[PDB]
Ligand binder design. Sequence first.
Ligand SMILES: Nc1ncnc2c1ncn2[C@@H]1O[C@H](COP(=O)(O)OP(=O)(O)OP(=O)(O)O)[C@@H](O)[C@H]1O
Ligand SMILES: [Mg+2]
Length: 229
Amino acid sequence: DIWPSGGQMTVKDLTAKYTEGGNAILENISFSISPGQRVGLLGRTGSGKSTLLLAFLRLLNTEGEIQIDGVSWDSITLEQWRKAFGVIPQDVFIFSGTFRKNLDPNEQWSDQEIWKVADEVGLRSVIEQFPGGLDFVLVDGGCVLSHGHKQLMCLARAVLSKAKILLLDEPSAHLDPVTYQIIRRTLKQAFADCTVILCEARIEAMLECDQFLVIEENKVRQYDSIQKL
Ligand SMILES: Nc1ncnc2c1ncn2[C@@H]1O[C@H](COP(=O)(O)OP(=O)(O)OP(=O)(O)O)[C@@H](O)[C@H]1O
Ligand SMILES: [Mg+2]
């Protein structure tokens, strides 16, 4: 009895735009996703791959209904909706606090449960080099941390918040290969039964997906197999 529970996603007549009365990048988009399913979102450049991820996070002017595990996005807080998602890549917002608060903002885990997730995402050697380890306060954003380590923190932060839908926007080209490998390893351990929406521009970068979505013109066509995509 928790939310999000499985990662089932249902989109119905979704229309996204960047300004009030602007051009509809996506119009009347509707599909559905099974819990824990690896979904590949295919689309050429400028087709609207990034726009669909921004529409999921209510970061644009969106009309239509999206629901996760039966819970509509009109039925919870905006902050509680985005917490169900894990977003990579992104401009990582580092809290003005310790490594612990940045990894466990809600203070729901012990330092043993945090260090184990930190070891999986490859942040073990990055935290141990600071005096106090998890108690090292991160100030001025996270300037002491690399850009790739910030995304590992965002990845580890998503695991500790128990997100069920992981959004990946062209990780094969817009992430360091080391970072992509660590995420793919997380998808077989902590994120083993979580929904992953893989957005790429070439089919070769989304072979391991069970289902596929193609952004043809301003529509989204659905395919349940790679055979004749
Ligand atoms: N701030 C923005 N404001 C208005 N329109 C935008 C904005 N960002 C993207 N778009 C428009 O929305 C369309 C698709 O945008 P989007 O960036 O999501 O496609 P994309 O698949 O991510 O392409 P790419 O990643 O190669 O840049 C484009 O026609 C683009 O002009
Ligand atoms: Mg993009």
